Each structure stands twice: as C-alpha cells, then as structure tokens.
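In practice, a research group might receive sequence data for several interacting partners and want a quick structural hypothesis before committing to experiments. The following worked case mirrors that situation: the sequences arrive first, and a predicted assembly follows.
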Amino acid sequence: ILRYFPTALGVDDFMARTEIVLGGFGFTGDNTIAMTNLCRDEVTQVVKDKIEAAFGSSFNTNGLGAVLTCGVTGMKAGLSRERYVFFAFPHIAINACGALQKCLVELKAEGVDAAVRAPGLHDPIEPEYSILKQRLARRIRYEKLDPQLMDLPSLTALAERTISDDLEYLIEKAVNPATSDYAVITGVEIHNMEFIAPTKAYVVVNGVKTHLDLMMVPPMSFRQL
Amino acid sequence: ILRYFPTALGVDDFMARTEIVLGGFGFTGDNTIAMTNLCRDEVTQVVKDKIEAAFGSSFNTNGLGAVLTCGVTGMKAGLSRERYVFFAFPHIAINACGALQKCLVELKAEGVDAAVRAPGLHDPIEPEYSILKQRLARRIRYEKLDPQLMDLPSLTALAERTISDDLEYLIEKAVNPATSDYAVITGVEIHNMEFIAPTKAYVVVNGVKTHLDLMMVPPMSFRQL
Ligand SMILES: [Zn+2]
Ligand SMILES: [Zn+2]
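A structural hypothesis for the assembly, expressed as tokens:
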C-alpha cells in the first residue's frame, strides 16, 4: 500500500491522531459537529462509521468521486462557541473509485482541453459526473499536468486537492471564523483493510489558522496494526 | 395530517402494501436491488431504514429536497433476471424540508420567471440548490401554476412530480426493460410519526407497464396504527 501512498495510516490510527490534535485545540467529541464528504460508493462506510462514533453530532454529504454539490445551502443546513470539523476523502482500491476510473479513461482519450467547460455548466442527465469531470479537467490544466502520465492514484490525488479547494470555498461562505472555530482534514481513503492517507490538516480557532502534521503525532499503540 | 395529504399512510402500512403488490409481480426482498432518493436531511432516516430492512441489496442517493444529481452514471453505478425498485420522496413536517421552504419564499418573492434558467446551468457555489430551484421553476411554469397561491405542501407536491419525472428520464437511459423488470414508487414523506403519501406507483415486467393503486391494497392489520 505504502508503495503508492507513503503517508497512508490505518483508519483507527488516523482517528486517534486526529482526536489527539483536536483536543489540543479545545475540540471534543461532544462540543463539535463534524461533517463528512465521501464518494457515494458503499465501500466508504468504515471511515464514516468511525467518524460518527467519534462525534456526538455528525452530518454527511456524498457524490460521485466525493464531488461537492451541496453548496453553501447544503452546508449551512447540515450545521445544528461553535465548533466544526470538515472531513473529505475520495477513495481508491489497492491490493474504487469507479467514477474516478471513468474520468481517467476519458481524460486520456480526449484532451484535457476537450473535457474542460466553464464553471456553472453541466450535463442535464449527468449532473454530478459532468461537474466532477469538469473540475478535474480545469484543475489538471491549472497545474500543467499531463493526463497521459497520470495513473488512477495520481488522479484520486488530484481529486482530493480539487475537492479540498471546493470545500474551502464553501466554508468561507458558510462559517464566521470570528464566532466559530473549525478544523479541516482531508486526504485519500484506501481499501485493501481500510486506510487514510492524510494530505491536508489545519485548524482555525479565533480566526487564526494553524497547520497540523498528523504524521508527526505519536500514535496510540492500541489503535495501530 | 390527512387534512393535507388524503392518501397519507403510516410508513409500515406503506411498506406492507408495497411488499404485497411487488410479490404479486415476482419481486422478492431477496431478488431485488432497491434504490432510494430522499432529502439530505437527518429526519428522512426512518423510510430509509425500513426500505433497506425490506431488501437484501439497497443503494441510496440524496440531495437538497431530494433533487436528483447522480445522473445515469450514479444510477448505473449503484446497481449490483434483473429486478429493481425505485423509491423517491421529498419530505415535509406537519403537526422540513428546509430547502423546499427556501424555494417557496424565493419563488414568491421574484417571479416564477426570474427563477427559471435553461437546463444545464447552475450556480458554482450552490449547485444542488440552484438545480433544484430551477427544475421547480420550469415545472411550475409548465403547469400554469401560480406560486402566489401555493403553500409548502403544494410545493413539496410539485417537487415530487418533478423528481418523479427526472427519475423516469434516468431509468430509461440506465435500464433495459427487455432484460430487467422494475418498479417505481414515489410520493411524499411526512413527519409528525412518519407517513408516506403515495402518488405514483407502477411496475414494468417484460417491457410492459402496469399501474398500481396502493390505496386499494388491503392493509396488514399488524402494520397499521
Ligand atoms: Zn467511488
Ligand atoms: Zn429536506
């Protein structure tokens, strides 16, 4: 597994290291509403059970390849000093995703160019999918990446970054950082059995943002493999 | 409750009457994959637990006001002679929805006209919501309805019809009626406690479609109130 995702952690190791840092900043399972975004696939169930067991109030969103469609309206809706934590993971299977696999094939078949369309457009009978593929097309072009060299892990990875930035857009619209503290933890979900390879973690307490490195957090011996 | 939804059934009564007719056409809990579309709200949980207890394989979608965004890609994905049944319910609370309530207010504030936009467009930071409101705007204009006279039940009701037609679009793209039999059951979910007011029910076995009236199905005395 690590031959693809060096930072991959067993999912319970991931949760413990997350509980450790959050508590460090005044978050508790009882004072925080969490939000999760995952692919619609049945396999994303473990991360989602683990998270809602860690928190009192949980609220989930999901779409193809974990694309974010709930917008500010969906996010503000799912929320009820204020404390939130936002998780987001596209998934992949090694030893899934499905929609990300289809994207890979098409992005290679036609240009990155053919696949891009402006924001605000979408296909009537493929809304989620078309929005998903269009955000990856733009994202790919915006980082001078060649889809010919990319494999499914690197696209699942590009996806995370895209998803991650769109989650950030929504949070700044929906949350007041002067009355609410919050955390953002995103990365890639991996199935063999279940792993999380973290890529981005920070907290915003008192409108001040601090980056965290989960990989530097000493693990609980009990929740390891 | 009935003062708003004459056909409202207790949810277990609804499930029994549904099990009775489906079995009549060769469906069983074990030979059928079901699919459910509901609002993203936490309250829609009972209908969803009841359905997946009735079936071996279940697959769910959901968005604001139960708008359908998974497209043909999401639907074909969620599926695995072939037998399927498709449920769809917007919700409402009497004694929810939230997104439908917001639509009501806006549709009344500006014209039905202002709110319509062509299919294939959507707002970048409100994808689900904007697609939801745009399909209701068009649907409203297409039935000479005046949003000034409409209340939240009638809009939840307009929504059902809209959702219902978009589900039909997807199914004909995604399912081969000559190799697959299927059923479509839609209506409105109501919270006091939990009710379903059915509005559309049919089955398609051997590319032949038969309408069913759940209201004429003799109820199980055991699953009533
Ligand atoms: Zn997936
Ligand atoms: Zn709702």
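Before designing any experiment, note the following. The longest strand of chain A covers residues 180-191. Residues B 39, 41, 65, 91, 96-99 surround zinc ion (ligand 2) (CB under 6 Å).
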